[PDB]
Amino acid sequence: GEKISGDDIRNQNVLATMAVANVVKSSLGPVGLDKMLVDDIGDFTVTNDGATILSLLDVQHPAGKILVELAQQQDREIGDGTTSVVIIASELLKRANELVKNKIHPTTIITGFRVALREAIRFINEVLSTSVDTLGKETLINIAKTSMSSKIIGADSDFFSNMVVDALLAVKTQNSKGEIKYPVKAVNVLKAHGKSATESLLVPGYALNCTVASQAMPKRIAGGNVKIACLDLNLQKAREQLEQIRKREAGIVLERVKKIIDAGAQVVLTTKGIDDLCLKEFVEAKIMGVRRCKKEDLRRIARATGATLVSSMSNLEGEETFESSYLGLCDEVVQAKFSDDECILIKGTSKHSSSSIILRGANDYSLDEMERSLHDSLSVVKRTLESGNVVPGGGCVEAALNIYLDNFATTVGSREQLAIAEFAAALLIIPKTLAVNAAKDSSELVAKLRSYHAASQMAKPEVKRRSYRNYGLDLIRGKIVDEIHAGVLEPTISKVKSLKSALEACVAILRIDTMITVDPE
Amino acid sequence: EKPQEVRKANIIAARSVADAIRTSLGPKGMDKMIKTSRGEIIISNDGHTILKQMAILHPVARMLVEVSAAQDSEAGDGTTSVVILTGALLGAAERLLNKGIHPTIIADSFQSAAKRSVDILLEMCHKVSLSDREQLVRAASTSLSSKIVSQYSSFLAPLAVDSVLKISDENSKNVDLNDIRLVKKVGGTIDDTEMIDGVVLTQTAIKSAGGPTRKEKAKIGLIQFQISPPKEERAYLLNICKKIKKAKCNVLLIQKSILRDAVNDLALHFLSKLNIMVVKDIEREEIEFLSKGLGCKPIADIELFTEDRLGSADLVEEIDSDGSKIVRVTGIRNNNARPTVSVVIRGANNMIIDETERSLHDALCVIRCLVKERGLIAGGGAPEIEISRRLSKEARSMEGVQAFIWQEFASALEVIPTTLAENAGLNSIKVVTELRSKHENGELNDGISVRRSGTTNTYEEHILQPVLVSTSAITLASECVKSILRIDDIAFSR
Amino acid sequence: GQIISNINACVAVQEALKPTLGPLGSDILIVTSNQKTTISNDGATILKLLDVVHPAAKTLVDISRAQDAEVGDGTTSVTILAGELMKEAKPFLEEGISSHLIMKGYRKAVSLAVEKINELAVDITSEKSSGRELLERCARTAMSSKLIHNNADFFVKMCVDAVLSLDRNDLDDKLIGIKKIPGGAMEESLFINGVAFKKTFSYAGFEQQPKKFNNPKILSLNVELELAIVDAEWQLIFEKLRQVEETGANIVLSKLPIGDLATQFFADRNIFCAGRVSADDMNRVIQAVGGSIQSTTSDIKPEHLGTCALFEEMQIGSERYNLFQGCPQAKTCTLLLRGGAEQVIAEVERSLHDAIMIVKRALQNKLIVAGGGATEMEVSKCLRDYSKTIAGKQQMIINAFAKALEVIPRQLCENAGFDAIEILNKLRLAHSKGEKWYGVVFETENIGDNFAKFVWEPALVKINALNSATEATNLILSVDETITNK
Amino acid sequence: LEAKKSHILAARSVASIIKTSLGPRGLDKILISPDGEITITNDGATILSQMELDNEIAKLLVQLSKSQDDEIGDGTTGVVVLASALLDQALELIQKGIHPIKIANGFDEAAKLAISKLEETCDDISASNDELFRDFLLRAAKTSLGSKIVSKDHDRFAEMAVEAVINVMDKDRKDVDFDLIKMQGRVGGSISDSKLINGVILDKDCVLPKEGSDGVKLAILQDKFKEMIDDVKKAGADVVICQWPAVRWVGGQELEHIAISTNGRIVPRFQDLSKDKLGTCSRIYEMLIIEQSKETKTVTCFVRGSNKMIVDEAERALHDSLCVVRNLVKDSRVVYGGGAAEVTMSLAVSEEADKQRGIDQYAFRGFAQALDTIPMTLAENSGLDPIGTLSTLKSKQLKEKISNIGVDCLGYGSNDMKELFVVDPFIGKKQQILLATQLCRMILKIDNVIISGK
């Protein structure tokens, strides 16, 4: 079919790249703005998340879809910074275009970026810091403020700081051959409206959204040794031989409930609704029935309370029974009204302890953004506790590393130093884009910040304390502030994997030479 | 002269394919992006993949795909070099038709020169041991660096060599690659690629209940049928499980049953109640790999199920890494004459995973030529001009006009160093000028190097190629161009 | 945004002149509606005949036309700098940086550049090179920096001796005009000490013309001589011929042609006469012989008749021309080009006229600096250290102008076939740890010292180059909109 | 480099047009004038000058041949072939990465070696007496200048033209006159009817000679008609030409040759008629025939022919001999061409390439290969193998010291040019090589061609 080769394809690759790059430019930084997407189904979705946009984004260019899969891999590896990482592919491929039109060979561009990022780890070793960082009184709050970038939660992040920290405090467990980590992605988030952001409650346990059929049951259980059972089977009314089968099936249901009553389970979790036959057995046995449960939420209950889901009741023989090993354990069961509904609160579980988060917002479009923003912050603390090395935030990292690459280019020399200079100018778009979203001047703070880092490497003792060297930048007032007063920092694993995952991503665009379009059937 | 115009248009179609792949030749080659009609984007420089999705209505251009496919059957590697050899002889055939040379004379000139080129390669062979490390990488090092991931190939170079040396023979056999399976998974990096000494199944089972997390001292079975009532109910399925526990089979392998028996929820709960590991949704093509590797006989009926048809394994566990579910088998019993291994491939994007996979199949086929023939020759297009030195020198003995086409075959060998100079960003004539003076006298194996930009020893840069790579390809490429000149015209029929 | 669209159209102006930089440069072929073939390296004739679309293209033409007064040569290495300053300024114009900071920062960079150029220019005088040396040894490669590579050795021993007769404080460009003689050789051109012009008209006594005069006298007369009515018209013309003989003029220059009566009267008395004299040739005789032009015979007097040493009739190219020698006042030496190719005559015509500009500025001040594009490299090296502390954002602004001067060594390597990166690494150490004067050498194809290479260039060329590129680049930034009626 | 590659291929197509016209044996091609008239002539300079192509590259070769026509006039084909040969080798050396000036510098250095080698082969024909010298001038046009058919014996009308410039030029062997040597054609009769006299014959309109005067008393100038006769009777002029015996409607420029040969002058008006303008003419008789038996430099060859192209082609061959004879008289350096000096100078340049080596070895080889294109072109025009022709010439010049062996186009047998009397001007071959390379340096400097809007 259509076959077109030459340098026009690489010029078209960056043209389609810069076209979709404008999507994440306005959403970068705490002051970034959201954008509305039309789903053509009558509704719309307003999101600044690059992972959600690139998924729905329609790209008619074959190479433009590579950036879509790049954000998907960064969600499992990192889980945050979607618009603060992928955005570099705009100018990085644009500066390489000037080298393609010149006599620079693509391998020099490829090997130039590899030697730059390989030796960049030693440059990062200067800005690293331990997990203790300052004198304390703020520990996981400083890393919780990392999610302020690219998101609008920075205004309400004051009260939400202690909510995220305390949610991951009691979920501690032992895994990874004895390593102590927090099993994230297991936190339940409930959507609610009313009051304000400061009224958000943190539940140190499991929260279930359902409706209790009979209010006369022991809704609130006082004391320990609470047994909870889980059954995937549906016990209800279901299909003169028709009346005889109805009586035989009713006896089978009452027999299976009798096995649960004999086990002493205080809470019975069912997938579907409960008929009137099972409700009469629960009141006499002082058991609270639960209906309309989601299978995905029941999987976390099996790990938390310790109640394994029962697919079917059977054994090696033809006897049906419910074993006692499928019962869960917790400290107490408390039921309170949460947002025009009564939810079950399971706290103090035996096997594993979980946590639930209740959020408040304006509308459903606001809660969708507030949920994913705080959900991505859970991975920020998780990835930070894995590697104690941390780097300061504020965009001062990209401006500082580009100065060391200037003398590093003179060390290597030859033709590989020109690609290093172009790679240093490519990283300068990150601090300049933040100035555009902050309605400030671009080169104003960039030229000044690089002046403090220019003499940073020239200081022999570090003369007295730090006259020039410092970290952090103030986007609101457009001034250079210290990282201690600003209180902003970012994890190292997020910054290293940023350019590391983008390494093979940008080169893949450069490796494209001949473009061929086959006509569809 | 209608037949002369048809062959002239065939050369243009041959040069069009050769000019496109020219950018992808050598280790400095460039990838090609093609948009398939199904909506999948595949970007690779492999000539087998490029010509697979190539859609051209020209009859000879369609035949050129089978020409490159024939090189994959005999060799299976060197797609950055030997692919242009098909269009190399056709590019110089334009002046041969103007001289009035009969096509059979052209076919006899290239066939006679093909046998002479083999004898030249047999003079340059080197001694290569059957078991070694650095020397076996030098022959593959030309083909080892193609994709962006070649930076991490430093660890992958001994891995691809030790993978073939694991299962092989010292009698110089065909070295079938069916025993070595490359399994892939989502997550990880290519630097974390590891090799396993036993069968690793990456197929994702339904895992409804998923009760057992692993099995210790289990017997891995092979079941073609499916456990389900023909299409009191549970009593029939429990009796089948009693026969399974009678032979002490804790691991069941079942193919895809959705065609007829589909899947039953009661059968999944019975195996989890007894903690019996089972894997479903298995393709039919995997029956040959699981039967010969583990030494298990297929069982088409529950009556034929017995202990003699079941294998055994030390430990059978399921590894969970980066969200991917893979099954590793520790130890193998009922050993046979066809042992199998496995290599776990780790990647991020599905295109990147398939990108590194084609690089491994290209590397594994290199040792197959070294085991069959211990001879070794220089790489990087160095012998291409060296062979031409022994050809054009004898042109004075061709006794008549045969010397003209005899030099054209030697001049066609200059296409290999010409494409490497343009792909590496160097002058074309400056390389050819240095080669003609270097290949004139001193020693052997010398030639141009794209890394050092000069004529020197190729083994100093650890760049070489097996002798069978250019031996079978040039003979096959010279044979395919003979049938191309046999086309008088293109006539459409029913 | 409107300026960016105007720059891209002006980029192709110097990109067509891209290979023309340096002595290895190429030429541009121009064919007009009259089918006049013009092949020359100088962009002044190129931009004059170049079709312009946007008015910004005329800006480079006005600077190129004014370049003859400021410098006059090296136009390939000057005009290209006007487009390079706006090429790298595109990322700055797209950002919040205003074009005023680029214009204001440019004058701050030129003020520091000219200060260093005057520092690089050193005048020893004293016992070092003097007249006939600086104009020969140091001006060997300085006179022609582009063309006349093979014939350079011929003109150093010829053209230098012609400009030696020109004294300082005069610098007359009216007497340096050349002529076009078909046929001959370049190195065989004869030196002419007086006014020489073409006959443009053939005579029946062309072979009978007097060979030479011992004491010739040139008289300029505008009287038209052309023939009861027959006796009256013949007598009036005869009376005018007798009044001219009373002055004793052996050479009579007539503006309008003369008939047979005036020719036969002058031939019998061996009196020379030439018709169809152009007005430009008359002013050349006034500044050489010192005569005067008489409209009629009423005011003609014997003291208005000038004289010169001797007259000679030269025959070259199968045609004879008038040759004057030993004029009373001659400030230059007339040169006559030769050769059979018309393009070659016009090729060296632009080159020789550009070489006199060096002699003009050398007589005022004698100064030489390192040539071969090494001047901008030392200036760009100094601007990198100063601009860091100068007025905030001006660091990146001056560094853009510092990298804009890097186009000169990149162009010299394009023609010679060298590497643009390899020359920058060698000069960076040569202009820092290697002090200053180390330049680039094309002959040995490596880096060497221009002091021992004998190749120098006047620093006054680079001084006016920045001033000529000042208002040229500032006008592009100062115009944000262009309107074309109809 | 891609722009000049198409210009070289376009320049080779122009050389292929005149490729068959090279040499005296060279065959012409039919040229059609834009007005519809057909032009058939064997002169290579006439067809190439009148032919106009589209691309400007071909027009640059027209200006090169324009100077060759006014100077040499015969054999201008070798100028374009040598210039195109330098561009044909430019497709290789320039592609190798060498700058054109570096290759152009080797051409100027090799040209000085060819001129110095050509000077050693000069043979002076003026060392003998006037009997053998004047015979060599007639035999010079017998072979080299002979091109068109029927020229096999042209000496009937050629000796009149050869002896024309001999009587005009002094015996000091240095003279040049372009004023009084012209060709006057006539349509009719045959080419064999030409005559050689001193004077000029016009197309416009007898008396016995006198004692003291040289005869006919030629004077260059009803009551008014007889009054002017009385003024003639004062001078006694028998024949008088009256512009403003009598003539009607005669031109002023046509009477210039009469006044110069007879030492007369033009009379503007009858009042200015005087005896001092009386000339001398031997005989005037009828179309009047003007003859002068005295010593004068005015000689005009009256030529007849049945067609215009027959007279035009015959005059251009005889008129171009003026520069040939001048180079055989005024210039004492005479060399033997036609494959002799071209191959001899090529062997000297080939030996210089191996001495310098470096980048000039391939540069000097291109200059020697360019000179070898002339004998290969003449070989195809003569029906001989180009490889076998050059292999024979180079084998004899290395073994034998005779440098006069050259290509035989017409089958003259022995290849010695000294025995065949084939002579070429020394300054001719010098100007053809320099001016050709002069243009080739400008062709390699072409970047982008600017053409005014239509």
From Swiss-Prot, chain A:
One of its GO terms (biological process) is chaperone mediated protein folding independent of cofactor. The keyword Cytoplasm applies. InterPro entries: Chap_CCT_alpha (IPR012715), Chaperone_TCP-1 (IPR017998), Chaperonin_TCP-1_CS (IPR002194), Cpn60/GroEL/TCP-1 (IPR002423), GroEL-like_apical_dom_sf (IPR027409), GROEL-like_equatorial_sf (IPR027413), TCP-1-like_intermed_sf (IPR027410), TCP-1_chaperonin (IPR053374). GO terms for cellular component: chaperonin-containing T-complex; plasma membrane. It is found in: Cytoplasm. Heterooligomeric complex of about 850 to 900 kDa that forms two stacked rings, 12 to 16 nm in diameter. Molecular chaperone; assists the folding of proteins upon ATP hydrolysis. Known to play a role, in vitro, in the folding of actin and tubulin. In yeast may play a role in mitotic spindle formation. Belongs to the TCP-1 chaperonin family. This is T-complex protein 1 subunit alpha.
Swiss-Prot record, chain B:
One of its GO terms (cellular component) is chaperonin-containing T-complex. Coiled coil: none annotated. One of its GO terms (molecular function) is unfolded protein binding. Keywords: ATP-binding, Chaperone, Cytoplasm, Nucleotide-binding. It is found in: Cytoplasm. SUPFAM superfamilies: GroEL apical domain-like, GroEL equatorial domain-like, GroEL-intermediate domain like. Pfam families: Cpn60_TCP1 (PF00118). The keyword Transmembrane does not apply. One of its GO terms (biological process) is protein folding. The keyword Nucleotide-binding applies. Present with 5530 molecules/cell in log phase SD medium. Molecular chaperone; assists the folding of proteins upon ATP hydrolysis. Known to play a role, in vitro, in the folding of actin and tubulin. In yeast may play a role in mitotic spindle formation. Belongs to the TCP-1 chaperonin family. Heterooligomeric complex of about 850 to 900 kDa that forms two stacked rings, 12 to 16 nm in diameter. This is T-complex protein 1 subunit delta. The lineage of its organism: Eukaryota, Fungi, Dikarya, Ascomycota, Saccharomycotina.
Curated annotation (Swiss-Prot), chain C:
SUPFAM superfamilies: GroEL apical domain-like, GroEL equatorial domain-like, GroEL-intermediate domain like. It comes from the Eukaryota. It is found in: Cytoplasm. InterPro entries: Chap_CCT_eta (IPR012720), Chaperone_TCP-1 (IPR017998), Chaperonin_TCP-1_CS (IPR002194), Cpn60/GroEL/TCP-1 (IPR002423), GroEL-like_apical_dom_sf (IPR027409), GROEL-like_equatorial_sf (IPR027413), TCP-1-like_intermed_sf (IPR027410), TCP-1_chaperonin (IPR053374). GO terms for molecular function: ATP binding; ATP hydrolysis activity; ATP-dependent protein folding chaperone; unfolded protein binding. Keywords: ATP-binding, Chaperone, Cytoplasm, Nucleotide-binding. Molecular chaperone; assists the folding of proteins upon ATP hydrolysis. Known to play a role, in vitro, in the folding of actin and tubulin. In yeast may play a role in mitotic spindle formation. NCBIfam families: chap_CCT_eta (TIGR02345), thermosome_alpha (NF041082), thermosome_beta (NF041083). This is T-complex protein 1 subunit eta. The gene is CCT7.
Curated annotation (Swiss-Prot), chain D:
Pfam families: Cpn60_TCP1. It comes from the Eukaryota. It is found in: Cytoplasm. GO terms for molecular function: ATP binding; ATP hydrolysis activity; ATP-dependent protein folding chaperone; unfolded protein binding. GO terms for biological process: chaperone mediated protein folding independent of cofactor; protein folding. Its main location: cytoplasm. GO terms for cellular component: chaperonin-containing T-complex. Keywords: ATP-binding, Chaperone, Cytoplasm, Nucleotide-binding. PROSITE patterns: TCP1_1, TCP1_3. Heterooligomeric complex of about 850 to 900 kDa that forms two stacked rings, 12 to 16 nm in diameter. Molecular chaperone; assists the folding of proteins upon ATP hydrolysis. Known to play a role, in vitro, in the folding of actin and tubulin. In yeast may play a role in mitotic spindle formation. Belongs to the TCP-1 chaperonin family. This is T-complex protein 1 subunit epsilon.
